[PDB]
């Protein structure tokens, strides 16, 4: 039945019906056993699509809002703000759903270094997504929760995974975005990304046959951000 859910999740993924893909993978998480690499990946892809659609909508509506602040059309701005708020409600609901799954099911049952890093990093990501649109105390709390999770993932990654491991590199990449975009700290973002890239370069003998393309891609993205940030 676990095998059946995974199949259903793969069919939903092919059909691009990511809500159903989330439904199926959340049931697998609901089983309180260590997920396979395949299952972790399917769950992560499902929520990143579901949340990504709303993050993309939110950025569009926000940019429309900013244009109109310059034209000062107030009837328009009332409708744009109400629309944005509706999308923020969905963003909050989706983040809260996977954060619950992580706290109740995935993290407690994770028993490998790789899975622990993967799930704390996911925790880091979803609080960071809450922080993207939050203001005032909600933003401070999301930022503090994101930081705690990313630090937890980093402690484990530093002791358990080689510096070329794609989950470790993916962690460095996203934690560096966190410092840049949420904490407004280009200096710390640059340091973290540069250190992760250099530490990988120092140990390229650790690249795995299973994941060298994935490692190579994240390292290119670390470099691409360093470019963007300098």
């Amino acid at each position: 039945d676990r095998e059946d859910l995974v199949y259903q999740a793969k069919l939903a993924e092919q059909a691009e019906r990511y809500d159903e893909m989330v439904e199926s993978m959340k049931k697998v998480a609901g089983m309180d056993v260590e997920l396979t690499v395949e299952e972790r990946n399917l769950l992560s892809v499902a929520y990143k699509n579901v949340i990504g659609a709303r993050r993309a909508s939110w950025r569009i509506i926000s940019s429309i809002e900013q244009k109109e602040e310059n034209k000062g059309g107030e009837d328009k701005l009332k409708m744009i703000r109400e629309y944005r708020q509706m999308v923020e409600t969905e963003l909050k609901l989706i983040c809260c759903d996977i954060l619950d799954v992580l706290d109740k099911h995935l993290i407690p049952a994770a028993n490998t270094g790789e899975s622990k890093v993967f799930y704390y990093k996911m925790k880091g990501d979803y609080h960071r997504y809450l922080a993207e649109f939050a203001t005032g105390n909600d933003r401070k709390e999301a930022a503090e929760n994101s930081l705690v999770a990313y630090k937890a993932a980093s402690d484990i990654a530093m002791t358990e995974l080689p510096p070329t491991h794609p989950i470790r590199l993916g962690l460095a990449l996203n934690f560096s975005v966190f410092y840049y975009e949420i904490l407004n700290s280009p200096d710390r973002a640059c340091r973290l990304a540069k250190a992760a890239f250099d530490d990988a370069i120092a140990e390229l003998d650790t690249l795995s046959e299973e994941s060298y393309k994935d490692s190579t891609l994240i390292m290119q993205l670390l470099r691409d951000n360093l470019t963007l940030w300098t």
């Binding site: 992560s44 892809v45 990143k48 699509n49 990504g52 990501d125 993916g170 990449l173 996203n174 975005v177 840049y180 975009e181 891609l217 994240i218 993205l221 691409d224 951000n225 963007l228 940030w229």
Partner: peptide
């Protein structure tokens, strides 16, 4: 506008 970890 920064790049975070991709999916697919």
């Amino acid at each position: 506008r920064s790049f975070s970890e991709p999916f697919g």
